Amino acid sequence: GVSLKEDLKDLVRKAEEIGRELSGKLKTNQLRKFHGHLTKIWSNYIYKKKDYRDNPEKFNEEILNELHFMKIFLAYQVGRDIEGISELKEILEPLIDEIKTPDEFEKFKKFYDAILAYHKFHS
Amino acid sequence: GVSLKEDLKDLVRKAEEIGRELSGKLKTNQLRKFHGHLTKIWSNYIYKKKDYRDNPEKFNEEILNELHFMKIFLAYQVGRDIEGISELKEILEPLIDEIKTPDEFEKFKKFYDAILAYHKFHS
């Protein structure tokens, strides 16, 4: 329930309620592709700050047009993250309950290691 | 689509496919604490391997029991990872929608700085 109509005071306070509700759950500094691309846009903005506050057309095609692609790529990538771990979870959960013997434990571990190894390879 | 009764080989073929798929979706270390619990259980088993392979009861109560906690813990972790990242994205997305002006931009940036900061603050 947060909005940019709100004054800075209230956003900053909500920004800390949010940062703490996140901290245990979300792995820290994992949205770094996004944080990065945001820092470049912001640098381009500070750069020509007074060039932008008088020129809506430049601002739109140079700054917020890039914000438009960021928000899209964020959603896409987050969307695929969620699918990924869910897929991994639905693959592993039933296998773990099929481990009934040491040999099956070994077969499981080899299976996990292979997923791991190829996950990290194809990147 | 996968079972431990399949032979070790047809399993690592399937693992290859799953791993390959996950490379385009998942960033590469989402299950660190899970991977860690696993290897700990695995190294426990390997360390007293002969003993475990000779006493099914000991294997059941010391390895299979822990693997069951691991299975429960994976659900919990994946669930938290998903709602963590989904929540942040659902806070960022609509705010980025609302950025139409320089003032709105720098107000966003300030909120984002604050989220990021009160987010790293708690580990």
d(CA A105, CA A88): 18
Under DSSP, the state recorded for A27 is P
Find the closest chain A residue to B117 by CA distance: A19
Under DSSP, the state recorded for A64 is I
The answer to whether the beta carbons of residues A100 and B67 sit under 8 Å apart is: no
- The two structure tokens encoding residue B42: 């695995």
Question: What's the per-residue H, E or C state across B9-68?
Answer: HHHHHHHHHHHHHHHCCCCCCCCHHHHHHHHHHHHHHHHCHHHHHHCHHHHHHHHHHHHH
**Minimum-distance CB partner of B74 among A87, A89, A101:** A89
Interface of B with A in 81-100 (CB under 8 A): 81-89, 91-100
Q: Do A96 and B12 touch (CB under 8 A)?
A: no
Instruction: Please tell me if residue B46 touches chain A, with a CB cutoff of 8 Å.
Output: no
Residue type, B111: F
Experimental technique of record: X-ray
Please tell me the total number of residues recorded for chain B in this structure: 123
DSSP secondary structure string, A84-103? Answer: HHHHHHHHHHHHHTT--SHH
Under DSSP, the state recorded for A49 is H
Task: State how far Cα A77 lies from the chain centre.
Answer: 7
Chain B partners of A43 at a C-beta cutoff of 8 Å?
none
- Identify which of A77, A63, A67 has the alpha carbon closest to the alpha carbon of residue A33: A77
Total domains in chain B come to: 1
Computed from CA positions of residues B112, B116, B121, B123, in that sequence, does the dihedral angle turn out positive or negative? Answer: positive
Q: Give the number of other CB atoms < 10 A from CB of residue B64.
A: 21
- CA-based end-to-end distance of chain B: 37
A63 lies in which domain range? 1-123
- Identify which of A78, A84, A86, A91 has the alpha carbon closest to the alpha carbon of residue A26: A78
d(CA A104, CA B112): 47
